[PDB]
Amino acid sequence: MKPHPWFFGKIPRAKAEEMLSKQRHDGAFLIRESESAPGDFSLSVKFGNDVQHFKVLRDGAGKYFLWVVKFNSLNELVDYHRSTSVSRNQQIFLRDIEQ
């Protein structure tokens, strides 16, 4: 198969912002491993000229989520948010980076 082009591993928050601020399309994102919280994943995404950061949460049942809908994998969370906004105030749909 093909590996996922959105997983960037352990990269700083500032480095994700520098990279995403240079993307052209709204929704360009990456998943990175948080340095502030070891073991947590951070979803960094571009909207307008800004770069917003979302913490990938895990509930008591071990399911991943951003708000209320629960997923069995990061892969499913990411794919679901290609057509459902990651934000409750803005319409930010995840779309792959131009590598």
Partner: peptide, 6 residues
């Protein structure tokens, strides 16, 4: 920070 916390 994080838009979704809390």
């Amino acid at each position: 920070x994080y838009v979704n916390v809390x």
